[PDB]
């Protein structure tokens, strides 16, 4: 019996790729279909060897090898929209690699994916990664705070947000993380109340908090 | 301050908390007397403090 008939009735939510080491990879697209395909091979109704791959799992499998044999590297994400030719999204303004070294990196990345045929390495600008992150953060009218430093930026969304602004700040972060990853730019949404709760204070370079009408507190300059 | 300080009764009902440091007190006392709201006077022997 073939493997594509031993899965469910719908022959479109899986894709069987023949490997290069006498194996047979099954490409699921989420965790629910990954547990669906792993129940078949774990209960043992297949006399050959086969694996179940996933985009989120393989993206950390070849990011564990890459921070040991290629440290100090700037990359974003590997895209598996066509699982026989993955696309490696590298950074342009943060690497010092020549073309001969990129050919060796494209050859060593091919051996970790036996189902693949030819990994394609493309470079992208480091500015549009934060430009799309700030432009999408300004359409939803979310109050934020950008912190620029070397090798990454950070957007901080604090305050007492209402319910439609936690939903719009979650539907945007999940859609950005699906396409760019979390290597370079990182959102820090933090729901907390008002600091200095109901206390009156006098801010700026010589600060005090009035704990009471007859009580002064002198912490750090508020 | 090299002189004793005498604090009145109505100006001793206020409270203060924090870490302070008296490197020069005659300049620190002018700043705290404007933030807390106080008047003071040095008559050669003591430093009186009122609100």
């Amino acid at each position: 019996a073939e493997l594509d008939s031993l899965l469910g009735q719908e022959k479109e939510r899986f894709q069987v790729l023949p490997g290069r080491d006498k194996m047979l990879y099954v490409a699921a697209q989420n965790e629910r279909d990954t547990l669906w395909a792993r129940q078949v091979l774990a209960r043992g109704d297949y006399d050959k060897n086969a694996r179940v791959i996933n985009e989120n799992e393989e993206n950390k499998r070849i990011s564990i090898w890459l921070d040991t044999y290629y440290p100090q590297l700037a990359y974003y994400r590997i895209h598996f929209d066509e699982p026989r030719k993955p696309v490696f999204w590298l950074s342009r303004q943060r690497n010092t690699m020549s073309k001969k070294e990129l050919e060796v990196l494209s050859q060593k990345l091919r051996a970790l994916m036996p189902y693949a045929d030819s990994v394609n390495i493309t470079l992208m600008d480091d500015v549009t990664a934060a430009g799309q992150a700030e432009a999408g953060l300004k359409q939803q009218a979310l109050p934020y705070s950008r912190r620029n430093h070397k090798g990454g930026v950070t957007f901080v969304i604090q305050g007492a947000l209402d319910d439609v602004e936690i939903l719009r700040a979650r539907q945007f972060v999940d859609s950005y993380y699906r396409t760019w990853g979390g290597r370079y730019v990182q959102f820090a949404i933090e729901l907390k109340d008002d600091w200095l709760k109901g206390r009156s204070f006098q801010y700026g370079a010589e600060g005090y908090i009035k704990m009471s009408p007859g009580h002064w507190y002198f912490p750090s300059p508020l | 301050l090299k002189e004793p300080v005498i604090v009145s009764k109505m100006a001793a009902r206020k409270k203060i908390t924090g870490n302070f440091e008296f490197h020069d007190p005659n300049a620190l006392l002018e700043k705290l007397s404007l933030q807390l709201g106080l008047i003071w006077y040095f008559d050669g022997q003591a430093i009186y403090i009122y609100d």
């Binding site: 109901g198 206390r199 009156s200 204070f201 006098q202 801010y203 700026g204 370079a205 010589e206 009035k210 009408p213 | 700043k31 404007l34 933030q35 807390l36 709201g37």
Partner: peptide
């Protein structure tokens, strides 16, 4: 910059804070 954030202050503790500026 300086400034004062009053939350239901009683107009004596408000004008005491302006006694430095």
């Amino acid at each position: 910059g300086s400034g004062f954030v009053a939350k239901d202050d009683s107009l004596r503790t408000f004008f005491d804070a302006m006694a430095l500026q």
